[PDB]
Amino acid sequence: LPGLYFLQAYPSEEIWRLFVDGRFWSKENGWRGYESREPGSLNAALESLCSIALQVEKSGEEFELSVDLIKRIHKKSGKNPGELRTDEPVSFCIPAGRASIKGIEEFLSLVFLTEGGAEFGPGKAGPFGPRFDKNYFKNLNPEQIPDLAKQIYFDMSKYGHSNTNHFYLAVMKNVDVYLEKITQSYNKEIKTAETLDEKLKIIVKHIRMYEVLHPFRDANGRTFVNNLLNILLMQQGLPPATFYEPNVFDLYSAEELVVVVKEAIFNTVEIIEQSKRKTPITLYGYHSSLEEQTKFRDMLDSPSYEKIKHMDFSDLNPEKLHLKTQKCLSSLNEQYPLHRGAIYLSDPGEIKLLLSNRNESQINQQIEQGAPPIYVGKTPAHLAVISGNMAMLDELIAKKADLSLQDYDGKTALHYAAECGNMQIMGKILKVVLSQEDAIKVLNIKDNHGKTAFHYAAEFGTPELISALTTTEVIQINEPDNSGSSAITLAYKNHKLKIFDELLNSGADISDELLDAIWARKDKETLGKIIAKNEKILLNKEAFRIAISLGSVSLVKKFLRAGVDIDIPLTKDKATPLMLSINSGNPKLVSYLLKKGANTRLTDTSGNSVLHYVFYSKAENREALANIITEKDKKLINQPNANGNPPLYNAVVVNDLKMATILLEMGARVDFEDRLGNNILHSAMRRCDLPIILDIVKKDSTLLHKRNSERRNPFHQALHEMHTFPSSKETEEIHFMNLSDLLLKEGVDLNKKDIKGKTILDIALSKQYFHLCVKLMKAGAHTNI
Amino acid sequence: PEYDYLFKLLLIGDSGVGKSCLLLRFADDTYTESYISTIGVDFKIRTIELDGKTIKLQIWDTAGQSSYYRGAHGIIVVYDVTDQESYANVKQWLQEIDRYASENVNKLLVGNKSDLTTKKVVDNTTAKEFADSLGIPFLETSAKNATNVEQAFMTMAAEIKKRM
Ligand SMILES: Nc1nc2c(ncn2[C@@H]2O[C@H](COP(=O)(O)OP(=O)(O)O)[C@@H](O)[C@H]2O)c(=O)[nH]1
Ligand SMILES: [Mg+2]
């Protein structure tokens, strides 16, 4: 039924390429990145394509596109999965580089999107779904659509070619209806199909609308593009589709998608053809090192495929297939053969012939929108540099091809030469670039990300490459990108150490942004290398902070050797070094600062003593710190002038009894009271949740009702609002051991609210009555007014 | 594993109110004046024993920039007491759970930075009045003091246990 000889013929060593996108191979070391992402996910996705392959052959019955199969393929993909979407919002971001002016016209033209009310247009992301500045579907005049297509492409582009300003939420009603009227409409037109190519147009036109509907919660792509499309291709005796960028089925015109598929078809054929030659394979600038190749075969698994490898296809003759493929793969040559040349060609004899007598307008042609997404914006130079086709780059350099030109993303030939990190093709470029008069300019060009040629070289490449870039004497090493990340900063974040050391040794001015990245990783040593190699970054306040916060006594020592005040406020809230030393890190640091004579009696913006900052540290190290600091000062009674409650309060509200006890044991006074009139008990009312302390605290002092909420107990019940039923027996039980104490101390039992509410009305509202209500009434507590 | 509930919780609100500071004070039981960003960890976990039943809490923090954020059983909408605008935007945050999440989901309003009493703009009773109009539980918290941080997550844990 389906031919699928190609899949069996497909070299079992390098069959990973069917499910991994070509745009990854170069940078993500082939399949590694896709394995790293979700390990054995390709093994299941290959299984999903090969388990469906066996199920559409054994069935026979001139099998047509069934909705029950379209579900089954999602069950092989893996609230329940493999079920249709119904009133579940699923949206996503699509960039200008995955769009076309004609593709937009087809997207807007689809009435079933406008009727269904699928949010489309510009706006920023949200935590659940998108938030739109405008919606193009509500009140849309189909005579505006053609001028509106360009108008939105200008908006999509002007923001960024590979960035996203525009989100799209799918229709959240009539999913099961719309999917069925397409599945049928496909079986309707595959009949009408007359020409061999006309078949390929309706397949993509249908799998487009399929993709645009976005029924399934997730994995709309792997099901409808990586699987279904291949099945439809394999059935008409065309091979699988090995794509570069298969995510254009949203905003690419039906005819434009035929090109994208034909390219992906030609890509697969190329893998087949090259594997027979036994020539080394290098498509989209990806070399296969024996290590990766050998490590794959023992980790391959995917047996449902293994049985359609050990299967007999001798009955069908392959040369009847070859003559069929060439019919649709003869269209690709004519349009932009230079660009396509840069991707696939190798033989200089063939390359030189192609470029024989090419004019200056033709040699520097940037493919305009609508064409497949890889080409759009790129000079043949760009592609030649990307795919590592030095053979093509030589002959283009021989024609004096303009290398200063930049694509729609804003990257020049030099940018890709750095990003792809080929020092040999980078070499050939530099020689030509330096020859130009505006070479100092050309070198210092920024893309739409702001990142210069050098920024890409730091984030990706070797020190020898960086050396060949710095030898130029551009002296734009210090400049940041749009994000504010310096050359050296990007180098640090991506663990490019030997590069980072070379950029540090070069003495690139340090950036505040980098020190915060050093904090996130908590990298003590790199700061140690920075302070050592720079050796005047000890004036930097934020550098001293990260040295105090996590940093060793040794790191901090270096800053006091440099000699800046031991009581210098160095955060927004005017925290002392000593204060920040307590929060976290080694208590050896606290004791050192105190030894050096660090002022104990200071207060942050909020008025909190050093001993307050003890209770911003994890409860484990709290006991040691509290003892170390009270040995020097012994003024714990000191408290936030702002509120006026000392650390005993802090101890209560963190529920740390061990500290609440030791502090009371240290003879911590219970006289204090916040500005709003609340006592320690008011806090220790419920939070403490243990009567042992409540007894010992009440032994010291008398409680006093304030802010029209008596004592702790009165205010206890006002703060227990939820009164959870499972613990409501425990909630009416704690107040027992609370009140039989209160009754000794004859609580006056006044009004206990600013809306005339009191202890007896609240308990009655609380429905904790069983215990309190009666025990209060017996005790002589007046009923509610 | 065999742990009783394993609840999924979500802290959402205007960037700066202290969603991160709250989470670290609940999870790690600490407070630092700056934001570590926890190297974009994107979530935190803590196991709590409520009603003699051991409950795990998977707690997700909202950043500035595979759709895992719908999965939550409860959403803690946070605002800053010292920022009127951060409370004004609460209404839009409450109608962004009406769109892209189950109406069965349990909500909770948290007014963070209660310790900055000296610089308090948003009124206790005004917020309570608003929170009780929609039948939502309301708590004020200080990640710094640690006041009501446990109570904040404990009430949210109990609020879903009841309904679940
Ligand atoms: N005074 C005070 N400041 C706080 C409190 N909680 C958070 N902050 C401040 O809020 C800033 C950032 O907090 P963060 O948790 O990152 O806010 P997010 O953007 O909501 O995550 C920090 O610099 C803190 O100083 C608090 O309870 N009291
Ligand atoms: Mg945050």
Numbering used by the authors:
A (entry chain A): 8 to 85, 94 to 800
B (entry chain B): 2 to 66, 74 to 172
Sentences from the paper on this structure:
We therefore developed a strategy to covalently capture Rab1b with AnkX via its nucleotide cosubstrate, thus allowing us to characterize the AnkX:Rab1b:PC complex by x-ray crystallography. AnkX1–800 reveals a scoop-like structure that consists of the globular FIC domain (amino acids 1 to 350) and 13 curved ARs (amino acids 351 to 800). Thus, AnkX is forming a cavity in whose center Rab1b is embraced. Whereas ARs 1 to 4 are serving as structural support for the FIC domain ARs 5 to 13 are forming multiple interactions to Rab1b. In Rab1b, no electron density is observed for the amino acids 68 to 74 of the switch II region (amino acids 64 to 83). Although the modified S76Rab1b is ordered in the complex structure, no electron density is observed for PC and the linker between PC and G108CAnkX. However, the switch II loop of Rab1b including S76Rab1b is not reaching into the catalytic pocket of AnkX, indicating that the structure may represent a postcatalytic complex. The crystal structure of AnkXG108C:PC:Rab1b:GDP revealed three interfaces for AnkX binding. F143AnkX is located at the tip of the thorn and binds into a hydrophobic pocket of Rab1b between switch II and α3. AnkX locally unfolds the GTPase switch II by F143AnkX-mediated displacement of Y78Rab1b.
The causative agent of Legionnaires disease, Legionella pneumophila, translocates the phosphocholine transferase AnkX during infection and thereby posttranslationally modifies the small guanosine triphosphatase (GTPase) Rab1 with a phosphocholine moiety at S76 using cytidine diphosphate (CDP)–choline as a cosubstrate. AnkX contains 949 amino acids and two individual structural units: The N terminus (amino acids 1 to 350) is constituted by a FIC [filamentation induced by cyclic adenosine monophosphate (AMP)] domain that contains the CDP-choline binding pocket. In addition, the amino acid region 351 to 800 forms an ankyrin repeat (AR) domain with currently unknown function. Rab proteins function as molecular switches in cellular signaling and alternate between inactive guanosine diphosphate (GDP)–bound and active guanosine trisphosphate (GTP)–bound states.
